[PDB]
Amino acid sequence: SNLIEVFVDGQSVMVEPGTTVLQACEKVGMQIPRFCYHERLSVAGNCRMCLVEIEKAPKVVAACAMPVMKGWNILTNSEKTKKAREGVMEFLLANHPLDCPICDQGGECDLQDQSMMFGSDRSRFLEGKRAVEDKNIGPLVKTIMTRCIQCTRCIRFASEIAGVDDLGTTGRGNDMQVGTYIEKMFMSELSGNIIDICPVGALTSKPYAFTARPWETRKTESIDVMDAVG
Amino acid sequence: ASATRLIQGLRNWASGRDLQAKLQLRYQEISKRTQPPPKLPVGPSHRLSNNYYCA
Numbered sequence A: 001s002n003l004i005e006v007f008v009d010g011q012s013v014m015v016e017p018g019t020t021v022l023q024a025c026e027k028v029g030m031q032i033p034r035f036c037y038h039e040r041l042s043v044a045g046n047c048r049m050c051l052v053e054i055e056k057a058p059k060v061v062a063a064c065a066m067p068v069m070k071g072w073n074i075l076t077n078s079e080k081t082k083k084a085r086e087g088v089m090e091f092l093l094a095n096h097p098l099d100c101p102i103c104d105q106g107g108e109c110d111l112q113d114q115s116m117m118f119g120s121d122r123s124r125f126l127e128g129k130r131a132v133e134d135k136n137i138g139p140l141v142k143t144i145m146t147r148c149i150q151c152t153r154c155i156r157f158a159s160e161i162a163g164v165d166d167l168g169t170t171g172r173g174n175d176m177q178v179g180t181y182i183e184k185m186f187m188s189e190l191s192g193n194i195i196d197i198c199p200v201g202a203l204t205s206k207p208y209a210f211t212a213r214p215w216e217t218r219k220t221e222s223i224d225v226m227d228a229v230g
Numbered sequence B: 001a002s003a004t005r006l007i008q009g010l011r012n013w014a015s016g017r018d019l020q021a022k023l024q025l026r027y028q029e030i031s032k033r034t035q036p037p038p039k040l041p042v043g044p045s046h047r048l049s050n051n052y053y054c055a
C-alpha cells in the first residue's frame, strides 16, 4: 500500500499519491468551492477560488492543482482562507453585469450561490464595468459574453471531449474574450453540454430561454429513448 | 371647539372635567400631510476599509 496520511481540519485520512488537496477534502467530506475546476476536464487553475491554507506555511495554495504530501494539515475554515475567498469573489463580481432578473441562470447560478455562502455582503466597486461584444455560435447556444468570467471550461470541453478545437481566448488583460474570432458555428454532437458546464449565464439554451425558472420546475428521473445508448 | 360658550360650560359642568384643553377631535395642530424628503443614514458596516465579512 502506498497510501499516505494527510489532515483536513485536524482529521486524519488516507490518500493515494498524486492526490490533489480538493480530492482529499472531498474524501473527508468538505467541498472546497471552485469555478474553473471540473472532475472530468483538465486542471486549469485560473480562477483562484479554491485557495486553501496549509498550516505552517506563509502562502495559500490552489487546492484544485496542489498535490498533497505527507504530514500536511489543511485548514478549510480558517481566517485567511475566507479572506482570500472574499477578495477573489469581490474581484470576480467587480465587472459582472447587473443582469440577474433577466438571466436564465438565476436560481441555479453557481456565482450567486457561493456569493451568498462565501462572498461578502456589499460592493466597494465605484468604477465603470466592461461590456463585451456578443457572439453567435448557432441557434442552440445563446451567447451573452458580458456575463462570462473567463473560466475556460469552453476551451477544455471543445478540445478534450468534443474534439472541435474551435473555441479560444482572443485578447490580453481585462479585454480578453472567449470566442471563436470569426463567424463560425459551434456545431457538434455534444454542443449543448457547454450550457451544462457554464457556471454563469453566459451560455444559455436558446429554446429554453425566457420560459421557466429553476425553483418552480419538478424534476423526474427518466431514460432517453432517442438512441440505443440509453 | 366650535360650540357656543353656553354649551361648553354645560358640558364642562356635566363631565366634571375640562374638555377644551384636550379634545379628541384633531385640528390644525396635527402634522402636515406633505413632508420634506428625508435622508436616511447608513449603518456601521457601510465602510470601504476593514469591512471583512468573516470578522
Ligand code: SF4
Pocket (backbone or CB within 6 Å): A096, A097, A098, A099, A100, A103, A104, A105, A106, A107, A109, A110, A111, A112, A147, A199, A200, A201, A202
Ligand atoms: S450569471 Fe449569475 S450572477 Fe450573473 S447575471 Fe446571471 S444569475 Fe446573476
Ligand code: SF4
Pocket (backbone or CB within 6 Å): A148, A149, A150, A151, A152, A153, A154, A155, A178, A194, A197, A198, A199, A200, A202, A203
Ligand atoms: S462562457 Fe461560461 S463555460 Fe465558457 S469560459 Fe465563460 S464562464 Fe466558462
Ligand code: FES
Pocket (backbone or CB within 6 Å): A033, A034, A035, A036, A037, A044, A045, A046, A047, A048, A049, A050, A051, A062, A063, A064, A065
Ligand atoms: S478551482 Fe482552483 S483555481 Fe479555480
Ligand SMILES: [K+]
Pocket (backbone or CB within 6 Å): A105, A194, A195, A196, A197, A198, A199, A200, A201, A202, A203, A204
Ligand atoms: K449555464
